[PDB]
């Protein structure tokens, strides 16, 4: 049993017709201190999988080492390591889910919320979540922490059910994701303006965008607001 120290906030994601999109800002909080700003919380595994992590950063780094090892180990005595026998997003997830549940079962959890996004070898999209309790679930859209409360409602307006997937394009999806990130920047006190976004498309492959920034924010209406009730000036 422990307590998170340096933490990463929301991780949001959704799937579109040709793949999945996942994003997460670059902040590493220390309580209410916005302590670190160059933290990458999206971990690419191979070229068909990206793992988004929130929660304790020290544990995130541990999961990173684990993922690198998975790649190294899968390459051993594997002549088809970059072909038929490369790591599938589902393998990477089942692995992490296993670890997450074993650790909570030993009363020593990896204090994180994880979302594994990718495209299977047969082209199928992959989006599944696992957290410190070992709980897992899939949905056309998935978000952790604050994003679960504010991103999902927005992302679900694009893909409310399975049949909305084929009707959604990368442009629509990426736009929804970028807007959600802005909303989270407005209301989440542990969020950052800088973030990374990655797309895993069954045709274009893995696109990993770094250093994005929330833009087009509305703040002007603030000038009109004064006092907290009766004040006029």
């Amino acid at each position: 049993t422990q307590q998170p120290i340096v933490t990463g906030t929301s991780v949001i994601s959704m799937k579109y017709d040709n793949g999945v999109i996942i994003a997460a800002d670059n902040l590493g909080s220390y309580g209410s201190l916005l302590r670190f700003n160059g933290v990458e919380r999206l971990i690419p595994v191979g070229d068909n999988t990206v793992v988004g992590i929130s929660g304790d950063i020290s544990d995130m780094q541990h999961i990173e080492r684990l993922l690198k090892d998975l790649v190294t180990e899968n390459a051993y005595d594997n002549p088809l390591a970059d072909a038929e026998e490369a790591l599938e997003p589902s393998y990477i997830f089942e692995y992490l889910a296993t670890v997450m549940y074993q650790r909570r079962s030993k009363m020593n959890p990896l204090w994180n919320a994880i979302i594994v996004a990718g495209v299977q070898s047969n082209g199928d999209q992959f989006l599944r979540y696992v957290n410190l309790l070992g709980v897992t679930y899939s949905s056309p859209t998935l978000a952790t922490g604050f994003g679960a409360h504010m991103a999902n409602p927005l992302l679900r307006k694009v893909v409310d059910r399975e049949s909305d997937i084929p009707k959604t394009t990368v442009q629509v999806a990426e736009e929804a994701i970028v807007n959600a990130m802005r909303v989270l920047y407005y209301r989440d006190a542990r969020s950052s303006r800088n973030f990374s976004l990655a797309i895993i498309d069954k045709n274009t492959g893995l696109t990993f965008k770094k250093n994005l920034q929330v833009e087009n924010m509305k703040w002007d209406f603030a000038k009109d607001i004064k006092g907290y009730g009766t004040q006029k000036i």
Binding site: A75, Y76, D77, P79
Partner: protein, 244 residues
């Protein structure tokens, strides 16, 4: 008296460990394999005797990778070889976990060295029946090594072991003399394919299959990779051509 050769860690009257020496016999009785250090990497090649047409070609791979920057090939009892590589892998993983940086070739060599030497310390274990050629690129260059069943190892410019080690060594020595400036990864791959072909005369009875791998700072980015397709055939031909 006698019987000094029935138990592993026993010193004979002349200070030898006969069981290690018998382990060597098992190595000399094995397929030939080599390693060539080039100007920015290393190349590994090995002879693969075609027992019969039934062996699916290209499937029974012998060269093994350790971590992501090291290659290992060996001659002798194959299972003993795998055993040693598994140890090397655990050994490399441990080093990376504590020091973050992937294990340096010299450091790695000693890990295998100590482990192998350990198997000559007790009569409850048997020495390793393989000589291993391995190496890769690291923070400061390329390194080639060869480890004997005694646990003895040194850095090499070129190395060979197995049935045709003499032919190979002869060839390697020529290369060393005619290239004081240094061979290139591209060249080494071909030269390696040739030596395996030449050294195959000491077993010319059975047909074989060529296998090459390399690790070059420029050609593979410092990662160990197998030579396949076009680059492979191009090397096979270069040999078939100079075999006549």
């Amino acid at each position: 008296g006698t019987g000094y050769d029935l138990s592993n860690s026993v010193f004979s009257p002349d200070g030898r460990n006969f069981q290690v020496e018998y382990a060597v016999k098992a190595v000399e009785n094995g397929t030939t394999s080599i390693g060539i250090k080039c100007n920015d990497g290393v190349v590994f090649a090995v002879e693969k005797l075609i027992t019969s047409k039934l062996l699916v070609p290209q499937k029974n791979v012998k060269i093994q990778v350790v971590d992501r920057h090291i290659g290992c090939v060996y001659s002798g009892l194959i299972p003993d070889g795998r055993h040693l590589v598994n140890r090397g892998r655990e050994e490399a993983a441990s080093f990376k976990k504590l020091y973050k940086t992937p294990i340096p070739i010299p450091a790695f060599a000693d890990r295998l060295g100590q482990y192998v030497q350990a198997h000559t310390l007790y009569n409850s274990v048997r020495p390793f029946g393989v000589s291993t050629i391995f190496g890769g690129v690291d923070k400061n260059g390329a390194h080639l090594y060869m480890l004997e069943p005694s646990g003895s190892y040194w850095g090499y410019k070129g190395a060979a072991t197995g049935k045709g080690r003499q032919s190979a060594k002869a060839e390697l020595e020529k290369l060393v003399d005619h290239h004081p400036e240094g061979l290139s990864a591209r060249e080494a791959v071909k030269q390696a394919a040739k030596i395996i072909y030449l050294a195959h005369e000491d077993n010319k009875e059975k047909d074989f299959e060529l296998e090459i791998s390399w690790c070059s700072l420029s050609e593979t980015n410092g990662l160990h990779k197998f030579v396949k397709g076009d680059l492979l055939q191009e090397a096979i031909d270069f040999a078939q051509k100079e075999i006549n």
